[model samples]
Target: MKALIIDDEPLARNELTYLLNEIGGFEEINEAENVKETLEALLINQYDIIFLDVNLMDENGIELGAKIQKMKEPPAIIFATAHDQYAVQAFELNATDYILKPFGQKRIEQAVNKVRAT
Candidate 1:
């Protein structure tokens, strides 16, 4: 799967990139720090899945999620954030799964598994 990781923190993006590599399904992995970059990347590439952070610089990830779901062939989204309260909105926006910050390998694997299953 081709994947994109969208988060503001460099460390968070790096860590997820590392985990995705370790889990071994992603054929290509890209990173975008905010909504603008995320949108730009989407315009340039087609990802099978996106790991999106809920709190962005100037936009809500849920709003972005809604927009992404409208793509010609929308990618599966897995919301990653420090806040769990957004779970309802995440699912409502058609997210495949939600992963809280400080996520582990198992959690990432679980989310990826679900994405593949779907």
Candidate 2:
């Protein structure tokens, strides 16, 4: 699956990558941080699922979800954020699931299977 990690924090991206790697089944993994690269990344890849980070610097990560919703062919979106409060808010955008960061191997695997269905 083409799994994309969208996070502004460098370490956050790194951690998610490590966990996804550990979980396996991901043949193509990609990353994008901040506005410039994210839009470009989306334009270039039709990922199977996107692991998104809501806590961003100099930008509202919620709006990033909005952009994805507007995509002609959007991927499955899973909000991986620090704030639990944004859980409900992300559903308004029809997110696949909202998971808190510091993600568990078990928890994240469940989220992936929820959509991957394989």
Candidate 3:
């Protein structure tokens, strides 16, 4: 599986990256610290899944997400957010799952496995 993570915080990105790496099936895991980078990244490559942030550094990740869905071939989405309030929105956008911040390895593993399964 190829995964793309769109998160503004280094710690959050690092934690997710570490957990995904441990799963051992990933061909490539890409990352973006903000909306602009995320958009540019999507244009450059294809992804199987995208672990996206709801609140980006310079823009709302949800907006970027909508844009992603309109692409030629959209990747499955899993929202990574600190605020629980966005859960409904995430689902409305057809996200595969919602993972709250400070998540443990177990939850992260489950999320990743679920994405791969679909």
Candidate 4:
């Protein structure tokens, strides 16, 4: 699986990236610090999944998600946020899952497992 970690916090992105590396199924995992970088990454590469932060440094991730849905073939999106209130909207956007932040390896594993199962 090719995954992208889009988050404003460097530590958050690093932690997830480390966990993903440990999980081992992902062949490629990339990072984007802000909305512009995230959109550019999507346009330039083909990704199987995207672990997106709801509150980016520049724009709301949910809005970006809406834009993604308008694409020809949107990649699977897994909302990664510190907020649980977004679960509904995330689901509405056809997100594979919404992960609460300060997430651990187990939860992250489960999310990745579910995505891989698809």
For each candidate, what TM-score against the reference?
Answer: 0.94, 0.92, 0.90, 0.93
1-118 in candidate 4: lDDT tens per residue? Answer: 8999998989998999999998888889999988888889999988988999998976899988878878887888889888889888988888888998788889988988887754
Model 1 residue 100 lDDT score: 85
The most accurate candidate by lDDT is 1
> Which residue runs does candidate 4 get wrong by more than 4 Å?
none
> How does residue 60 of candidate 4 score in lDDT?
90
- Once fitted onto the true fold, the runs of candidate 3 whose alpha carbons sit more than 4 angstroms away are none
Clashes by residue pair, model 1: none
Lowest summed lDDT over 10 consecutive residues: which window, candidate 1?
A: 109-118
- Judged by TM-score relative to the true structure, which candidate is superior, 1 or 3? 1
Q: How does candidate 1 fare on TM-score?
A: 0.94
Better of 2 and 4 by lDDT: 4
Off by over 4 Å in 2: none
Q: Going through the candidates in order, what is the number of backbone clashes in each?
A: 0, 0, 0, 0
What tens digits encode model 1's per-residue C-alpha lDDT throughout 1-118?
9999998888989999999999997889999998889999999998999999887877788999999999999999999888889999987887899998788999999989887854
User: What lDDT is obtained when candidate 1 is compared to the true structure?
Assistant: 0.90
lDDT of every model, 2 decimals? 0.90, 0.84, 0.83, 0.88
Query: How many Å off is the CA of 32 in candidate 3?
Result: 0.5
